[PDB]
A paper describes a structure:
Our recent study revealed that yeast Gln-mtRNAGln is synthesized by a transamidation pathway involving a novel heterotrimeric AdT named GatFAB. GatA hydrolyzes Gln into Glu and an ammonia molecule, which travels to GatB through an intramolecular ammonia tunnel. The third subunit, GatF, is a new type of AdT subunit found only in fungal genomes. While the GatC-like portion encircles the GatA–GatB contact area, the NTD forms extended interactions with the GatA core domain.
Author numbering:
A (entry chain F): 29 to 58, 67 to 113, 129 to 176
B (entry chain A): 6 to 33, 42 to 410, 416 to 464
C (entry chain B): 27 to 165, 171 to 264, 270 to 289, 296 to 327
Write the structure that this text describes.
Amino acid sequence: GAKIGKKFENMNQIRDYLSRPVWSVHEYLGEPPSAEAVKKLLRLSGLPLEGADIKEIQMRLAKQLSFINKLHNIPVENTKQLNYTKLLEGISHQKQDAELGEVSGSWKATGLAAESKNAYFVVKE
Amino acid sequence: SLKESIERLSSFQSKYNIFTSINPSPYSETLTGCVASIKDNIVTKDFPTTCASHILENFKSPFDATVVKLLKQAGVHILGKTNLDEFGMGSGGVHSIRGPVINPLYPHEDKKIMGGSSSGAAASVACDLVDFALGTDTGGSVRLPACYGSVLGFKPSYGRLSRFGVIAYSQSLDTVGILSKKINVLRKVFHTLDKYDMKDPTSLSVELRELIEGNKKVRRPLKVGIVKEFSHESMPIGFHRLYLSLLEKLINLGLEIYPVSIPSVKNCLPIYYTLSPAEAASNLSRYDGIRYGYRDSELDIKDGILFAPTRSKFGTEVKNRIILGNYNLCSDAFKNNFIKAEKLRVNLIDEFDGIFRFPNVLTNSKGNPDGLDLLIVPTSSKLPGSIRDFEEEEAKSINDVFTVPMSLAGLPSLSMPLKEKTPIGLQVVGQYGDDSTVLDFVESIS
Amino acid sequence: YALKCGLEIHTQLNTKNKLFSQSTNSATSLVDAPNHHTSYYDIALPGTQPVLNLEAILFAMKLSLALGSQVNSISQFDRKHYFYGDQPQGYQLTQHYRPFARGGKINLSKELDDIDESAKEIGILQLQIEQDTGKSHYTVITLVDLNRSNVPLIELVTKPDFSDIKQVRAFIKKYQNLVRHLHISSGDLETGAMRVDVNLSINEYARVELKNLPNTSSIINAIKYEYQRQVELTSSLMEPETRGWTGSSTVKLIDYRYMPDPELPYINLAPDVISGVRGLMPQLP
């Protein structure tokens, strides 16, 4: 738990405190997933399988997971309600904001697309 | 000098690779005539917003971000958009389709890193090209480059500044930040942008802002803590002389300094690298080339994987994050790592609440009357290395050890230089919502 | 043999505007020009953010009250992740972990509902608010219209209380009448304003779910087919399997990485919302 000590009386007390035998965060912080796991991950990430270095991904992920899995050994230790009038007041004050492009036809929704067909977006089979 | 300022701009741009785009007419209310740069993950009507990514290489937003709009209304001149690590992922400022930003504290042939991900932002301020810069800070991405540029870098409390139009990396952590050499300019900009925005569902409510204001008390004197867990890293040569010099100055001004232990900060990196990649994978799910941005010329599918041809143009580091993030979100890993990280994050916030005098309006802590007003913590434990060394070291296997805890807890934190043109800094940290205390303190001692 | 049948009913709400954006929720989607009723958010532009339409809360309240459901003290929206042309964010917002309401029921009687049983109650599992997706038109290139993306839906899941097929028909009929009477939806199966999925299992065998049923006639037929088809069996029906429908027969047919949305606030309603909305309810039959 968190703790506050006595006030420092002079600068040398701070120098001693900063020199105490205490480990750094660096010192405190010091079986890869299968190839089928990486391929699954690449698919969920919408990334290509062709050209992917599977073993390299396995290795990197293995290191990453070993770092975050340090959490496995760390143990563990009434908000603003929306009421009726606020519900109804909130509803009554809802409107279309020009700065959000909420008015129908206020901007060309397909205008930023590299490809389209008339007013439709297109996806190729 | 208007022609001389433009020549300086052109020279520093070519040597240090600071901007991704520049106002066609460079240097032509409250901040009238101020010049700003804007990080290129913050959308603008008048410039492309690329996120330093092939994915959005020529993306043009139909709208300005709220922070951009507020600055324009205050009469600020936007000089251009600054280079960054792709999609805000990176701490060195080296991952960009435009190439790395070079640190202008050194000759450009030295190829010293600027730090990231607000690399261009910090450089533009260090070079005296702009009066201030907006960046974003997710785990230290404003404070760290500011430290390396020897300028002020402020990350305000979570939710104070609007994220509408701020391209998402990790929404529970993302914060708009401000960089400048002048504390007076930084405070004015913060005051201009510290506003409730109804477009942003995470924007701090007007009610809560007033609650915060109403909790301010006279502190006689200010009580400052030195954090045990942050006091034992190997620091650059000369750091301790500068650090102790600053601490002695404070003590001679009648401030009280205390040792404090906040044990939960040691586990912040594993927590961060569980939650943040998960959110990133989620937020980058929209990119497919169908509605905007880059699109593969021939294929919307490959290997039975939809949008893979287009999405292959993500940077390597971005793709690394997406893959890890998706791992963390899968059913088994979620119920284990993600849920645990969330609880530890809550724990961390409770530990901060326990040592701060100021009440936390988000957790309804009472505040500790025997507690502290500010924490003083190093910004970094490393000097900027060369771009070569950084990339070499990155391919092997922490620069955010000091900055991540305040991100996780949404605390206001300002990195300040200890010496002119020296890439060494200290963070002044306050309780959630106590931004004015942090800023006024820094103003007081400069 | 015993039929254990349940229904999953998606219903388009007729709020004026959409669920997480104030863009228009159009009642004339078939004639509308494509991608016309779409905000920056609907197109999932970089930097856009969801904001909950409170009218969807009101509508969900009225339905919960009519069913006698228990409204959750806290509900939340989660992200259901997958890639598809009509899903611009790359995920759907839905209430997976913490639904708006739980419990409730609908009473059926022989007297009023043409049921063999004098009285039969159909229990409700839960009630969820979620986003609709865009519309895809396959012409090979597929055309995507996002007018319907982000339209509010309520998903109602019943308990497996259906034994007879007459019960299924009577329930759908009454549920349609209810949503129209509460003025929260047209309840029209023809327009897609209401969509009915089925899950069933005979005599405690593996659960099978029937998808893509366009009208009440097709639901009844798929159920009857699947019932007799399963009776004939039996190693293939040991594990759960989702099937489809083709007018004549039923044919056979991913980690969604559910994550609570990190931006949207919890739905935390004060007790007076319950009593307040109660007073605004129409007389029920």
